[PDB]
Structures are given as C-alpha cells and as structure tokens.
Amino acid sequence: ADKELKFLVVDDFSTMRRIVRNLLKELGFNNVEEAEDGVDALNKLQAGGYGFVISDWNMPNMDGLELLKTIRADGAMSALPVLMVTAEAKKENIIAAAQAGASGWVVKPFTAATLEEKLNKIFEKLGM
Ligand SMILES: [Ca+2]
C-alpha cells in the first residue's frame, strides 16, 4: 500500500489512460506511466521499477491476456499484480485470465472508490 508504487496503465484509448491516471492520483498514487498496447507495456516494464499493472483486456497487437501471460513467464516481473480492465464481465474471460494469473478485474466505467476496493483486495490477497 505504498503511495509511491509505480503503476503502468495499459490501454489503447488515451482518454481511458488519463481517467485511470486521475483516479490513481486521487487515491494518492502519483507514480503512473502509460502504455498503449501489450508490446508497448513490455518495452516499458523492461526498464523496471514497476509495481502494479492496470491493463485493458482488449488491445490491438498484444491484448491484455497475452500481456499477462508474458509478464507471468518473465523471470523478473512474474509477480507483478495485474488488474484487468474490461467493459463487460464474461465468465470465460475471467476464467482465462484467472489461469494466466490476473490479479483481479474491474469493469469500466468505474469510480475511484471501486478502483480502491480493487487495489485494496489485491494488496491483501498478496499479503501486501
Ligand atoms: Ca481497449
């Protein structure tokens, strides 16, 4: 629950990224970087320093699930929480992501209260 925890907000809609970034700031988390797709995020995650990944399920080039599976397979970031963002809960998606290792799901649009409950729950299931 460290306020300086560095977030990576991955989403191909720049407006969605700003929303998430403002929601985060609002909660007290100001260390936020953005990525527009799976590849982009990996390029940034490489540099290190990251602590939390907020990712959109649906992205061109490298989607949310393929990004999560790549992180999880990465020796070094294999343990980064990944909160999946979707516009519609679907059981098969939730199940796919579950097995690939997603830290949770948030259905957009969402409020800061919702984003906070999500984070809190993740921070907790992680003994974090
Ligand atoms: Ca998207």
Q: Interhelix angle for 91-100 vs 64-73, to 10°?
A: 20
Half-sphere exposure of 117 (CA within 13 A, CB side): 7
CA gap 22, 45 in Å, rounded = 21
Cα(20) to centroid(ligand 1), Å: 13
The fold for domain 1-128 equals: Rossmann fold (3.40.50)
Q: Which residues surround ligand 1, an ion (CB under 5 A)?
A: 12, 56, 58
CA–CA gap between residue 78 and residue 4 (Å, rounded): 21
Residue 123 Cα to ligand 1 middle (Å): 25
C-alpha 114/C-alpha 12 separation (Å) is: 21
Reported resolution, Å:
2.0
Q: Are 67 and 101 in contact (CB under 8 A)?
A: no
Give the determination technique.
X-ray
For the chain, the straight-line distance linking the first and the last C-alpha, in angstroms and rounded, comes to: 7
Nearest to residue 45, comparing CAs of 27, 28, 70? 70
Locate the domains of the chain by residue range: 1-128
Q: How far apart are CA 20 and CA 10, in angstroms?
A: 10
